[PDB]
Amino acid sequence: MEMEKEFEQIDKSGSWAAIYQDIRHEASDFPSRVAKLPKNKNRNRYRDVSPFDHSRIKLHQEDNDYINASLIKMEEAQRSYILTQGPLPNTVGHFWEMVWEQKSRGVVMLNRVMEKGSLKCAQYWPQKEEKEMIFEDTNLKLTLISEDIKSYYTVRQLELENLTTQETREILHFHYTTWPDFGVPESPASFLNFLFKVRESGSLSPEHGPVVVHCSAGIGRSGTFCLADTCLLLMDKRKDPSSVDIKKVLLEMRKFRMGLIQTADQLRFSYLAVIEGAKFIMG
Numbered sequence: 001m002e003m004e005k006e007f008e009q010i011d012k013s014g015s016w017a018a019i020y021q022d023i024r025h026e027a028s029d030f031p032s033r034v035a036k037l038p039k040n041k042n043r044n045r046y047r048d049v050s051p052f053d054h055s056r057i058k059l060h061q062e063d064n065d066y067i068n069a070s071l072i073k074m075e076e077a078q079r080s081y082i083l084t085q086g087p088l089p090n091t092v093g094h095f096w097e098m099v100w101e102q103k104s105r106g107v108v109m110l111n112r113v114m115e116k117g118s119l120k121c122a123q124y125w126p127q128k129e130e131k132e133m134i135f136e137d138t139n140l141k142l143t144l145i146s147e148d149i150k151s152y153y154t155v156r157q158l159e160l161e162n163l164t165t166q167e168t169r170e171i172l173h174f175h176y177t178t179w180p181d182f183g184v185p186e187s188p189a190s191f192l193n194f195l196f197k198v199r200e201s202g203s204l205s206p207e208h209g210p211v212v213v214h215c216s217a218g219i220g221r222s223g224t225f226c227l228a229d230t231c232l233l234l235m236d237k238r239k240d241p242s243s244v245d246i247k248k249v250l251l252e253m254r255k256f257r258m259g260l261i262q263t264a265d266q267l268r269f270s271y272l273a274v275i276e277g278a279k280f281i282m283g
């Protein structure tokens with residue numbers, strides 16, 4: 001049933017919680033044995049957050065292929081995304097190796113390095129042109145080319161170098177800066193404006209490798225990001241954009257990664273973004 005009618009009635013009523021919980025109860029339960037090996041212990045930021053074996057990204061490394069990252073593949077909607085945790089001090093190098101092997105064009109970041117007085121991730125990119133970073137473990141180098149600072153987001157151009165072969169690769173870093181410490185944004189406009197810019201650069205397009213998106217854990221914030229985009233897209237694609245059911249798309253995405261969207265609030269945000277979003281691509 002029509003999204004807005006649905007959202008109007010879930011609100012009126014107060015039921016966001018009920019609905020979130022039902023999604024939670026029917027979500028897929030696939031194994032995660034590799035994440036759990038003992039040898040893979042410093043490569044995981046949260047214990048209740050793992051990547052399924054069947055959809056995890058392997059590092060092209062002969063000694064430890066393990067990384068906390070997942071490939072979400074949406075069939076109908078012709079889109080692929082990689083969702084992953086914020087890098088830890090020992091995985092910084094692995095992070096950048098995946099970007100390279102996966103042939104990604106963009107990197108989407110939805111958190112701040114420090115939120116609520118605590119560290120949420122490592123400072124994994126260089127902050128001055130002349131102050132480059134070196135990934136000894138992975139034989140890669142990272143260089144800051146340009147910065148463009150905005151009110152609600154920051155975009156950075158980055159250059160990766162195979163030390164090995166002197167090969168280079170230009171990467172695009174999209175950093176959403178203003179998700180609040182507590183809660184959800186009031187209005188979705190800014191996040192939507194941030195999506196479209198992501199879209200506009202080609203970073204989600206098929207002639208490139210899949211886009212890498214992270215927050216802290218890689219599932220709440222990050223899940224909102226792609227849920228909203230997929231849906232928007234389906235709405236342009238189908239005959240009746242009124243059939244797209246957000247709850248179904250989410251359960252689907254979750255066949256690929258656990259816990260996409262972490263709170264009822266977060267689910268309701270998701271709706272708003274989609275409703276407003278569509279206002280644009282139906283006019």
Ligand SMILES: COc1cc(C(=O)O)cc(OC)c1OC
Nearest residue numbers: 076237238239240241242243244
């Ligand atoms: C309501 O169901 C569908 C409707 C449309 C459409 O084009 O309206 C496309 C679909 O995907 C193939 C559907 O999924 C089964």
